[PDB]
Amino acid sequence: LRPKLSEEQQRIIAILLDAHHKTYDPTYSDFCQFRPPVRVNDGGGSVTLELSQLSMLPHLADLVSYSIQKVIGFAKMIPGFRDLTSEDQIVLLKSSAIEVIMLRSNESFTMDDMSWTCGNQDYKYRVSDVTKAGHSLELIEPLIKFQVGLKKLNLHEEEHVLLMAICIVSPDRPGVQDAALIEAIQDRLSNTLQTYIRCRHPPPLLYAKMIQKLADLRSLNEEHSKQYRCLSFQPECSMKLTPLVLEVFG
């Protein structure tokens, strides 16, 4: 069966497309406002050296901080999100933040050279930049695997925005109070996505692959949390971050 999208489902898709267009600048025009990228010599990927310098950390922390603000804005526009309590909205945003950033970064991600191309050479980010921010291969290798696997799904913009909305509105996040309300909002989003794929995605299993990406994001979130904890032990690290990053990941 291929039921047509209801008027309400068509409205949800329009709302989410508009939300993404207002909160994701595909020209990356604000990036020059961040603390500048610094790329030192570290061909060997020396952990001691990367931790002693964290050369790319101020630029990447400003980029993540900016992205969290945009994600907060996108989330406020998800139909139903405003019906949740303030406490539940914050629990969902804090727990999903890194996962939504990983999803949204797929738009700048290119398989041409396995980089995140956000403008000129200064804003072209690679694995080596993430290591220069104090992260290890345990996060980097599954991160690139996730980006390639997601890129290969060739998602329509409608599917990409619904995936980010489903990611945020997850009833199984620790500390949630009204899990039933969150689940109701997510089911409305999931049904819209499932109906959209069946009635709009041409051939050549897509929904199950998308659900799998959400599970992959949980593993990446856990690995990122462990790595952030290690990074927080580096003296003077806090100054290289932002108050928003400190609160979200602390």
Binding site for ligand DS2 (CB under 6 A): 60-61, 63-64, 67, 101-102, 104-105, 107-108, 116, 118, 125, 129-130, 133, 135, 139, 224, 228, 231, 245, 249
Stretch (H or E) spanning 125: strand 124-125
96 is in an annotated binding site: no
| Minimum CB distance to ligand DS2 smaller for 60 or for 150 | 60
67 is in an annotated binding site: yes
Q: Which residue is nearest to ligand DS2 (CB)?
A: 108
| Minimum CB distance to ligand DS2 smaller for 108 or for 191 | 108
Q: Rounded to 5 degrees, what angle do the CA atoms 184, 156, 28 make? A: 100
Q: Which amino acid is at 233?
A: F
| Minimum CB distance to ligand DS2 smaller for 139 or for 210 | 139
Q: How far is CA 111 from CA 35, 92, 116, 138, 154, in A?
A: 27, 31, 9, 21, 12
| Minimum CB distance to ligand DS2 smaller for 5 or for 116 | 116
Contacts of 36 (CB under 8 A, 6+ apart): 58, 59, 122
Q: What are phi and psi of 242, to 5 degrees?
A: -140, 160
For residue 12, the Cα-to-chain-centroid distance in whole angstroms is 20
29 is in an annotated binding site: no
Q: How far is the CB of 74 from ligand DS2 (least distance, A)?
A: 12
From the annotation, which residues make up the binding site?
A: 24, 67, 104, 108, 135, 224
From the annotation, which residues make up the binding site for calcitriol?
A: 24, 67, 104, 108, 135, 224
